[PDB]
């Protein structure tokens, strides 16, 4: 397991360019990136497809619901802190 903070900043008439799903492990809510769009504000921040969301802006969003992060993330505005976890096979 890697972990990196991110900072993501984006402007007013804009998204951040990435999507992400919500996994009920064996349950345990896991939330992770599923697309992050090209030069988006996501993709220049760092953030990469496959990386769980484990924080955003100190909260620990571990065990969140989808539409909570969902909302928890809209209600960011343009600045965004996510706590990444990941790993490569290579
Ligand atoms: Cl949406």
């Not at 504000?41 to 909570?68: C, F, K, M, W, Y």
Request: net charge negative.
């Amino acid at each position: 397991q890697q972990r990196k903070v991110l900072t993501l900043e984006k402007e007013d008439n804009q998204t951040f360019g990435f999507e992400i799903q919500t996994y009920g492990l064996h349950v345990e809510m896991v939330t992770f990136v599923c697309r992050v769009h090209e030069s988006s504000p996501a993709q220049l921040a760092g953030l990469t497809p496959g990386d769980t969301i484990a924080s955003v802006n100190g909260l620990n969003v571990e065990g969140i619901r989808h539409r909570e992060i969902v909302d928890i993330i809209k209600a960011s505005g343009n600045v965004l802190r996510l706590e990444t976890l990941y790993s490569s096979t290579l």
